[PDB]
Amino acid sequence: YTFIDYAIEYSEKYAPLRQKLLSTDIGSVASFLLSRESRAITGQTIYVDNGLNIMFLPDD
Amino acid sequence: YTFIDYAIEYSEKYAPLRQKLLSTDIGSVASFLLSRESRAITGQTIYVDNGLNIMFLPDD
Amino acid sequence: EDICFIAGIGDTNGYGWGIAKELSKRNVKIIFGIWPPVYNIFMKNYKNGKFDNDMIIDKDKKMNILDMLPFDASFDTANDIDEETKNNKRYNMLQNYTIEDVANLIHQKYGKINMLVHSLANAKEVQKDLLNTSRKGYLDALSKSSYSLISLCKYFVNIMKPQSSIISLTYHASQKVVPGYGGGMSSAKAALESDTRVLAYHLGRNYNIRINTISAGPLKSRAATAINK
Amino acid sequence: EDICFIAGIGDTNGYGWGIAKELSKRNVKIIFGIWPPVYNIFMKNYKNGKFDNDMIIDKDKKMNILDMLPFDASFDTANDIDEETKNNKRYNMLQNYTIEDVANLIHQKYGKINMLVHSLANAKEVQKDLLNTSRKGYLDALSKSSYSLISLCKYFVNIMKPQSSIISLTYHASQKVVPGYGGGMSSAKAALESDTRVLAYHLGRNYNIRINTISAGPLKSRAATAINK
Ligand SMILES: NC(=O)c1ccc[n+]([C@@H]2O[C@H](COP(=O)([O-])OP(=O)(O)OC[C@H]3O[C@@H](n4cnc5c(N)ncnc54)[C@H](O)[C@@H]3O)[C@@H](O)[C@H]2O)c1
Numbered sequence: 001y002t003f004i005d006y007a008i009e010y011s012e013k014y015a016p017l018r019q020k021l022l023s024t025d026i027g028s029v030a031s032f033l034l035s036r037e038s039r040a041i042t043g044q045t046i047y048v049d050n051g052l053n054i055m056f057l058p059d060d
Numbered sequence: 061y062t063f064i065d066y067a068i069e070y071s072e073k074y075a076p077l078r079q080k081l082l083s084t085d086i087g088s089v090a091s092f093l094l095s096r097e098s099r100a101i102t103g104q105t106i107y108v109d110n111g112l113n114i115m116f117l118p119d120d
Numbered sequence: 121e122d123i124c125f126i127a128g129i130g131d132t133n134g135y136g137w138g139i140a141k142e143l144s145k146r147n148v149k150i151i152f153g154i155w156p157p158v159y160n161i162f163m164k165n166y167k168n169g170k171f172d173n174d175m176i177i178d179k180d181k182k183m184n185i186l187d188m189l190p191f192d193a194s195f196d197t198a199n200d201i202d203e204e205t206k207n208n209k210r211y212n213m214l215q216n217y218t219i220e221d222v223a224n225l226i227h228q229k230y231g232k233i234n235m236l237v238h239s240l241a242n243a244k245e246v247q248k249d250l251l252n253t254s255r256k257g258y259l260d261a262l263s264k265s266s267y268s269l270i271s272l273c274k275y276f277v278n279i280m281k282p283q284s285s286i287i288s289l290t291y292h293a294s295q296k297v298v299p300g301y302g303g304g305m306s307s308a309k310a311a312l313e314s315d316t317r318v319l320a321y322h323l324g325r326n327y328n329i330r331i332n333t334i335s336a337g338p339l340k341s342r343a344a345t346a347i348n349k
Numbered sequence: 350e351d352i353c354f355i356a357g358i359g360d361t362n363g364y365g366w367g368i369a370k371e372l373s374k375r376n377v378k379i380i381f382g383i384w385p386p387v388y389n390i391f392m393k394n395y396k397n398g399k400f401d402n403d404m405i406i407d408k409d410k411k412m413n414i415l416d417m418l419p420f421d422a423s424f425d426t427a428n429d430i431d432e433e434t435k436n437n438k439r440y441n442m443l444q445n446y447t448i449e450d451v452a453n454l455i456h457q458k459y460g461k462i463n464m465l466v467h468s469l470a471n472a473k474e475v476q477k478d479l480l481n482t483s484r485k486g487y488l489d490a491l492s493k494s495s496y497s498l499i500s501l502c503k504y505f506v507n508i509m510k511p512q513s514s515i516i517s518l519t520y521h522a523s524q525k526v527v528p529g530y531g532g533g534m535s536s537a538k539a540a541l542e543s544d545t546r547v548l549a550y551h552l553g554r555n556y557n558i559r560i561n562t563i564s565a566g567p568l569k570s571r572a573a574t575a576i577n578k
């Protein structure tokens with residue numbers, strides 16, 4: 001049932017943080033990176049994915 | 061003249077952003093990571109080093 | 121006096137919108153870059169109040185959209201546009217939609233900005249797996265999704281203040297294999313992440329500007345449903 | 350009512366202080382955890398108004414410190430402290446400084462908190478390079494610099510509200526080699542960074558709590574000068 005539905009169901013079941021990923025979650029981080037609050041950060045890839053990227057082997 | 065002075069001097073000369081790195085520079089980023097603004101970020105290693113880590117070969 | 125230009129919006133169901141919403145909370149003026157093909161439809165829904173609820177910033181605030189302009193990331197300058205599009209029913213009633221053109225337009229109307237958001241991605245053969253992607257599709261994916269970031273920086277750095285910030289959106293498919301993310305999109309994201317580092321070097325040293333990329337998790341957006349696998 | 354416990358502050362020249370200062374801008378109550386060896390020196394200089402300058406948050410804001418407690422990250426519970434340090438000059442007049450004791454202590458006076466900062470590191474043989482570090486010096490570096498994070502979490506998780514956040518400080522020497530960073534400190538950081546991920550899984554799944562680590566650049570702190578190389 002389409003690539004995106006699988007990825008999302010998977011993310012919500014295996015990600016360390018079991019919550020819905022809202023566009024505003026990415027928005028708040030974008031907001032921070034665009035502000036002067038993050039003056040010492042550049043050239044980085046920041047992960048805003050409820051931490052799914054740290055997982056190797058799933059529980060189920 | 062100790063490791064620290066070399067590291068500081070090296071950073072200020074070769075990092076993508078040439079400016080002194082302040083404890084408050086890390087402070088504001090820490091502040092962001094501790095607030096609900098970053099609810100979707102966990103298990104990450106965030107670099108706050110004026111981007112020095114992205115360099116391989118120094119300039120001069 | 122913060123102004124942010126968001127390159128890549130067609131609706132309120134993607135990341136560009138969520139970013140715009142959050143930026144408004146902080147009182148930053150927003151300028152949308154809308155892809156010509158959906159520009160008029162977008163203006164229609166905007167004018168008919170179809171987005172009104174989506175513009176309410178929780179705290180009784182209203183999203184402050186400074187402007188909305190047709191924008192196609194596949195054209196750098198005016199003389200880069202071919203006949204086929206120059207005669208397209210959509211691009212006809214439009215002008216000044218190339219990267220250099222919108223930067224000049226923005227600079228002229230509002231002056232310098234200090235925030236840029238690259239939130240666009242496109243790939244003709246995104247449905248095919250890497251092995252079956254043609255040279256044409258692969259390059260079209262990297263042209264629209266990767267190079268577009270470099271071109272944006274090259275032209276907008278002239279209308280940006282020192283200490284401005286830039287971000288783009290990427291996906292973990294660039295580092296680990298996720299089947300279904302084809303058409304050269306994983307390749308383009310891998311390039312976008314590498315270029316972010318390189319640009320950080322050039323933009324940081326020469327203009328004191330920062331650039332980062334956000335690797336986001338899944339989100340049910342229009343272009344997300346487009347991926348068939 | 351945001352409450353933060355900052356573990357690892359011996360003066361105003363380190364990161365623990367810059368963090369404290371920045372948190373104050375957002376009006377969060379700060380609780381300092383001072384290492385007993387320098388607890389009296391800190392309290393003294395504080396009372397004698399030798400830090401008043403440093404407590405200025407520019408905007409007339411005065412740094413608001415909720416409390417200052419003695420704390421030693423090498424001891425999990427009271428019966429973990431050895432007779433020697435128990436009777437040491439600097440420890441004799443103090444109490445409830447182990448990890449379990451400070452958690453219980455903070456819980457009684459202020460209840461549950463929602464922010465925890467791990468800002469400490471220590472290594473006896475930091476002057477020697479890895480090859481020449483003894484088993485004892487190595488395990489000491491990890492015990493103080495890495496496990497202390499896991500321990501803080503284990504005890505403070507009971508006094509933390511859901512959706513709380515935890516951070517620590519790491520250095521790039523864990524991923525790429527920087528000679529001079531010895532005594533197993535590079536080892537300690539590699540461990541800490543890996544443990545951040547694992548703890549992120551356990552804390553996120555069971556307590557819906559987050560944990561990240563900041564990899565900072567060079568700062569001429571007291572402990573940074575210790576690295577004689
Ligand atoms: N949705 C996700 O699950 C997800 C995950 C990780 C990263 N991303 C990234 O987020 C970004 C935004 O995507 P989204 O998924 O929110 O979808 P989206 O569909 O809202 O945004 C993509 C936009 O690109 C525009 N576009 C296509 N060709 C263009 C061109 N030539 N010129 C200018 N605009 C053009 C489209 O109109 C569209 O609005 C993308 O870069 C994507 O790779 C998304």
Ligand SMILES: NC(=O)c1ccc[n+]([C@@H]2O[C@H](COP(=O)([O-])OP(=O)(O)OC[C@H]3O[C@@H](n4cnc5c(N)ncnc54)[C@H](O)[C@@H]3O)[C@@H](O)[C@H]2O)c1
Nearest residue numbers: 358359363364384421422469470471518519567568570572
């Ligand atoms: N200064 C840098 O260049 C640098 C760079 C990257 C990461 N870091 C990290 O920043 C953190 C703070 O270091 P800093 O460099 O600001 O130095 P700092 O010397 O101010 O902080 C370390 C603190 O830990 C305390 N300490 C030592 N043993 C302890 C114990 N058993 N129990 C509790 N406290 C103990 C000390 O009193 C000291 O205040 C460290 O974790 C360090 O690894 C520092």
Ligand SMILES: Oc1ccccc1Nc1ccc(Cl)cc1Cl
Nearest residue numbers: 004240241242243246291343344
């Ligand atoms: O980058 C993505 C990752 C997961 C789900 C959706 C996207 N976005 C995307 C895909 C394919 C195409 Cl052609 C365009 C876009 Cl914006």
Ligand SMILES: Oc1ccccc1Nc1ccc(Cl)cc1Cl
Nearest residue numbers: 469470471472475520534572573
């Ligand atoms: O972790 C670091 C990286 C670069 C410079 C200084 C530090 N900090 C540090 C070193 C050694 C010891 Cl024993 C204690 C500390 Cl806090």
